[model samples]
Target: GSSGSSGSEDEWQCTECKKFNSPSKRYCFRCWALRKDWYSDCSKLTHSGPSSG
Candidate 1:
């Protein structure tokens, strides 16, 4: 007998959004969210002037 859950590769669901995602993905793609905030939010610019990282 196989030592893993028996099903086709298309049966996996994301733990975050409960949506279908590739088994190789690290995060949910439907929400466009990530566990880390490494990317800059340019839309939050201050009234002082241009923003810098």
Candidate 2:
């Protein structure tokens, strides 16, 4: 049996890059995805970020 690692309690893993970061901030360091922004919405035919409209 194999489970996906561990770093329980405080540290929350980023939904985007799947990396773990301390809760000092509310955003994902790996991809800067906000914790409030649970909908990563990355990949597929979806639009990307950093583009000035």
Candidate 3:
């Protein structure tokens, strides 16, 4: 499971929780209740490496 780029651009996540989400979504439905800045934070996490986990 630790093979390919886990943080590839295609991977998606919930902007609010920063957790993995569906790729076909334009906005994180789960994060809709959170701040609008969630989108920015989510983008920032893309391509990020795992923390030695």
Candidate 4:
């Protein structure tokens, strides 16, 4: 079977606020929460300001 986890193509849900963030983001764009509980691929995109997401 394929591994359940993939690359940045998958969106991640924030464990802190339950908000959704783009796969390329390092934090929850809505809550400024760090991307935890999952492996992150920061190489996918640049971490711009709040509107970056």
Arranged by TM-score with the best first, the candidates are 4, 2, 1, 3
Candidate 2 stretches greater than 4 Å from native:
1-9, 37-53
**Per-residue lDDT of candidate 3, residues 1-53 (tens digit):** 47656565675655567866557666666765333443444435345677432
Query: Which of the numbered candidates is closest to the native, going by highest lDDT?
Result: 2
The regions of model 3 sitting more than 4 angstroms off are 1-11, 33-53
TM-score of 3: 0.32
* lDDT per residue (tens digit) for residues 1-53 in model 2: 96556744677887778887888878787898886545676766446765544
TM-scores of the candidates are: 0.33, 0.44, 0.32, 0.45
lDDT of candidate 2 vs native? 0.74
Candidate 1 residue 53 Cα shift, in angstroms, is: 54
- 3 versus 4: better lDDT goes to: 4
Q: What is the lDDT of residue 5 in candidate 4?
A: 63
Native-to-model Cα distance after best TM-score fit, residue 38 in candidate 3, in Å: 14
- TM-score, candidate 1, is 0.33
